[PDB]
Amino acid sequence: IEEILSKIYHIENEIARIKKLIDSAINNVNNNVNELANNAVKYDDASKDKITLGGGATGTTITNVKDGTVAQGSKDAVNGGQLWNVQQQVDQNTTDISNIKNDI
Amino acid sequence: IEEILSKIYHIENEIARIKKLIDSAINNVNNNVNELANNAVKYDDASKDKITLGGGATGTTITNVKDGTVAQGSKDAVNGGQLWNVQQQVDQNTTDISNIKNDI
Amino acid sequence: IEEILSKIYHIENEIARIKKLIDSAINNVNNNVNELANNAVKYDDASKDKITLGGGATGTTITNVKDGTVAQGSKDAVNGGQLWNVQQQVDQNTTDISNIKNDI
Ligand SMILES: [Cl-]
Q1: Which cysteines are joined by disulfide bonds (chains A, B, C)?
Q2: β strands within chain C, DSSP E
Q3: Listed residue (A83, B65, B66) closest to C83, CA to CA
Q4: What part of C 20-39 touches A (C-beta under 8 Å)?
Q5: Hey, are the CB atoms on C60 and B37 less than 8 Å from each other?
Q6: What is the CA radius of gyration of chain C?
Q7: Can you tell me the distance from the alpha carbon of B9 to that of B11, in angstroms, rounded to the nearest whole number?
């Protein structure tokens, strides 16, 4: 009988240990999920047809974008250095056009 | 003894409570993980060298993109208003070129 | 009494079953969270003002980008086919400018 009572005491202790484990394990996983929920970039809905970036009214800079292929129908994103290359050629054309005209 | 039996009854009840807690806590965390898994934008593999957006064959619009720096070697993404500014200058050049030629 | 002892034995077995459940359920959820943590595209901090893509020093290609609206102030990302269309018009202008000049 004093054996029964001791066995019950240990059972009670193990139940308490289990409750402590559940609470710590669940808190840990919820903490990790919460962190990701708050920092993941998300599609706006299940269509995945749009990502409205989360930076607010002044927007979100995306950077470390590798140069996209500039070819007909390419769906790769392009970056500021790619646009700068075009801008340089356009500025030359604008200048040359002005130079030709002012030569008259 | 009737004490032992009562203690056992309560132990049984607590075990059932614990099983109910585990099931609810795990369901909650799985629900939150599932939601994020389905709406997070993902890299295609562990290299992180590419994101193929999930909008299907007609693609994914990214919007609220802050103007990227247009400078040599910039890796910032650029947006449609930045391209529109270039397009405007190109259209002027095209027109002026046509005007110069038709002046002959 | 032999009833008490049997009830205790079953209680012990159920506690072990519960410990096995907790360990499997938690491992499963941690595995799914870990996978997402490693493949989700993330904002750099709580401002969400920037995403520095995770592809390393040579960057990350974003693809399957739907054509963005090219209009004044548009914050839609643009893609390589959109840039290619502009490049084509710029190359024409450059050529025509050279042709006009070499006609002299
Ligand atoms: Cl031009």
Answers
A1: none
A2: 50-52, 61-63
A3: A83
A4: 22, 26, 29-30, 33, 36-37
A5: no
A6: 32
A7: 5
